[PDB]
Every structure is written in C-alpha cells, then in structure tokens.
C-alpha cells in the first residue's frame, strides 16, 4: 500500500443483506383497496348523463386513495370493456369524480343499460 492521496478515508467494507429470523408482522397486510372497493357509485345527474350519449363516456365516484392507473384497471376488471383514458377531479363535497372514456368499439348506452342506469 502506497497511500497517494493526503486524505485518509474509510475502507469500503462489507455490509450484510438483511436476513431476519422471523417475519415481524405475521402476514402481508392485505390490500383493502381491491376492485369492488375502488369504484363506489355510478352517477345519474343530468350533466353526467348527457356525457353518456354525447361523448361515449362514463362517470363514477371513486375513493380518494385510488389513482388513475388503478381506476383504469378496475373498470376493465369489473365491466370487461376497454378504457380510452381517464380524467379525474376532486368533487368539492369530498369524493373523487372520475370520467372514463371508452374505446370507440364499445357503446356507453349499452354499458349503461347493463349496469342499470
């Protein structure tokens, strides 16, 4: 060893990967936010209803924890229809209002008739 630099620093030493002897919360904390708990309501106001005919677009009320990718997955995994894109806003009462544009193949009127509204 011929120590060139005037500064003396630490040697890069060995740091162990953590390998515990027991799990520390007994279980995976289960996902409370699954697909039936993401999407609360469909919405039957007249302004939201007008978008169904005129824009091929559905309106839902979502809990505020869920983001746009999870809404885009949940609408597919419940209603078996594609998602063009998703706009969201926070409705000033407190919930999240999510507009979901469907694919051009599908029909918002048929999906409204088959979810009941």
């Amino acid at each position: 060893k011929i120590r060139t630099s005037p500064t003396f620093r630490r040697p890069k030493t060995l740091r162990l990967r953590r390998q515990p002897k027991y799990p520390r919360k007994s279980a995976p904390r289960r996902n409370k936010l699954d697909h039936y708990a993401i999407i609360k309501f469909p919405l039957t106001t007249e302004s939201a209803m007008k978008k169904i005919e005129d824009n091929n677009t559905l309106v839902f009320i979502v809990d505020v924890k869920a983001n746009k990718h999870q809404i885009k997955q949940a609408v597919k995994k419940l209603y078996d229809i594609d998602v063009a894109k998703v706009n969201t806003l926070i409705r000033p009462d407190g919930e999240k209002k999510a507009y979901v544009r469907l694919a051009p193949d599908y029909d918002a009127l048929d999906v409204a008739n088959k979810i009941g509204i």
Binding site: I2, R3, T4, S5, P6, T7, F8
Partner: protein, 234 residues
C-alpha cells in the same frame, strides 16, 4: 526498433506535473491514530519515573524463546482437555475402583492475585511479568516485591504472547512453583541469568530516569549549533 523513442518528462518546479509520491508522512490521520502516535512520542519526551522505566528494559529474544519452550509444556488445561481429564478420570475410577490414581500435576499458576499470593508466601520459583500492561499500576508493585521476597522475576515482551500458552487473550503474569524431573536443570540455568539481569542489578535500575529524549529535529539543530560553536572556537 523503428520509431520507439524515449519521451522523458521533466519534474522540475514550474513545469510538467508531479507524479504520485509515497505521502506516508503527510496524510491527515484521524484522531485515534494521532493519539497513539503522540502518546508514544510523549512517553519518549517526558522523564518517566524509575518505577516504570524498568519496562522497555526486558529480556532478549533468544532467552525469551527458551523460556517459552520451557513454559510451553506446563500448559494449563483448556476446556476440551479439562473435560477429557474429568470424564476420563471418572470413567477410570468407576472401572478400576481406585482411590488416588492421580499422582501430582505440576502446572503453572497465572493471574496477578494468584502470583502475588505465592510470592508473599514464598512458593514461587520464577515470576514472568508481561511488558505491555496499559494500566501500569496493575504491575509496578511486583518488581520491588519480588526483590524483597527473593523470588527471581523476568520482564518479557508481549502480553498477548503469554496468552497463547494460557488459552486466553491477556495473561500479565506467569508463576513457576513446581518443576518436573528433567526441567530442573533448565530452570536453574534460566534463574541464574535472570538473577544476573534483574535482581542483582535492582539498585542500579532503581535510580535510572528513562526517557528525557528530545525530538530528533531539535537534537539535529542543537548539534548543528554545536558544530557552529566548534567553528567559533577552532
């Protein structure tokens, strides 16, 4: 052979850059490094008292190796061989139904309390004292005490080197009280040279003040001024 020129560099001041030199003496060491180095230099600068300058005056390497060849075979039993002697002695006494098959084990005592008791009651033949005891108050009574009680003592370098014969890290002291048949002449041969070194020269050693050694730069400066004094006189 065709092109293959020499391209020398010139490492003068004000031109082509310096290469990487050794830089051992100039690296900014951390705190504990500088502490132990200034600790050694502070021992060398100050006037150490004669009770503790006795250490750094110790037994040489050849006689230390001969003493260790003596003490290597008086090894106290560590856990495996103590377990072996206990279980095997219990098995043989349970088989042969004997009372006292164990004749005499001669073994060396260690530890400062176990040494000092034997030196007070005059059982010790030879006291081995380690050099490197960092609280020196743990030792500094022992040379004058062994001097009064007549037991010869030898200062040997390396307190870890006493640990490898006692199956432990630090040992600080080794007592010799009891010898075998063959080892008596070797032990007396050791005790003669040890009494020549330590005990009979105790009144000599007790008045030496060790250390008081100035820094070599300052010693070189005073010696250069002494040559200047020689230039003034002659």
């Amino acid at each position: 052979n065709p092109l293959f020129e020499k391209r020398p560099k010139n490492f003068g001041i004000g031109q082509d850059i310096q290469p990487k030199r050794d830089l051992t003496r100039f690296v900014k060491w951390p705190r504990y490094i500088r502490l132990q180095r200034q600790r050694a230099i502070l021992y060398k600068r100050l006037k150490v008292p004669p009770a503790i300058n006795q250490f750094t005056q110790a037994l040489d390497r050849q006689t230390a190796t001969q003493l260790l060849k003596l003490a290597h075979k008086y090894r106290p039993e560590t856990k495996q061989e103590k377990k072996q002697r206990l279980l095997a002695r219990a098995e043989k006494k349970a088989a042969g139904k004997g009372d006292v098959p164990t004749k005499r084990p001669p073994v060396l005592r260690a530890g400062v309390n176990t040494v000092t008791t034997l030196v007070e009651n005059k059982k010790a033949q030879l006291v081995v004292i380690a050099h490197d005891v960092d609280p020196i108050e743990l030792v500094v009574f022992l040379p004058a005490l062994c001097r009064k009680m007549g037991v010869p003592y030898c200062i040997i370098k390396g307190k870890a080197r006493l640990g490898r014969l006692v199956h432990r890290k630090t040992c600080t002291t080794v007592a010799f009280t009891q010898v075998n048949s063959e080892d008596k002449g070797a032990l007396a041969k050791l005790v003669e040279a040890i009494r020549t070194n330590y005990n009979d020269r105790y009144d000599e050693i007790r008045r030496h003040w060790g250390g008081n050694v100035l820094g070599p730069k300052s010693v070189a400066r005073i010696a250069k001024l002494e040559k200047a004094k020689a230039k003034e006189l002659a």
